[PDB]
């Protein structure tokens, strides 16, 4: 009898995975694709906070999907005050996020707030951008 009372014993594809907004009405809006943008006049401090964010999210099991970088700004001394010249540059980097709740929303912002270092800026938003 081919099949058996042990049929389906090895099925490796419903277990594994295969191959906007977050709607969720009433509880409502369970923040979806948000790009938190880490920007600094430094390089190492900006990277070390994306370091801190990404490890924070996986600790809190809320999903991250990108960690890429916006490329670098090319500005001198802006010659608005013998006219001065020295190139100070800015290093921006993207951290994405996919899963958030309403009830973790204001809290998970605080751990980003309280731990945010010297001279860096965040900016949460939705998604319409490319490199």
């Amino acid at each position: 009898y081919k099949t058996k009372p042990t049929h389906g014993i090895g099925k490796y594809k419903h277990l594994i995975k295969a191959e906007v907004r977050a709607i969720n009405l009433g509880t409502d809006y369970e923040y979806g694709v948000l790009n938190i943008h880490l920007t600094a006049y430094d390089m190492t401090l900006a990277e070390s906070y994306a370091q801190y964010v990404h490890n924070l999210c996986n600790s809190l099991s809320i999903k991250v999907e990108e960690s890429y970088a916006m490329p670098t700004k090319t500005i001198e001394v802006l010659q608005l005050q013998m006219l001065l010249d020295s190139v100070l540059t800015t290093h921006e980097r993207v951290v994405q996020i996919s899963g958030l709740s309403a009830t973790f929303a204001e809290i998970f912002l605080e751990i980003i707030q309280s731990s945010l270092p010297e001279g860096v800026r965040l900016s949460v938003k939705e998604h319409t951008e490319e490199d």
């Binding site: 401090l45 010659q79 100070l88």
Partner: protein, 45 residues
């Protein structure tokens, strides 16, 4: 808790020296940045 991300190296291989430069903003506030050409000050117009 502004110290959690404070201390780090350069995580790259080939790279110039970065010096402890104190840039300072329109709002009066100064910041420890890292920059070449060790002007200890930079002032942004």
């Amino acid at each position: 808790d502004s110290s959690r991300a404070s201390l780090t190296r350069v995580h790259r291989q080939a790279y110039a020296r970065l010096y402890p430069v104190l840039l300072v903003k329109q709002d009066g506030s100064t910041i420890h940045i890292r920059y070449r050409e060790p002007r200890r000050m930079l002032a942004m117009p």
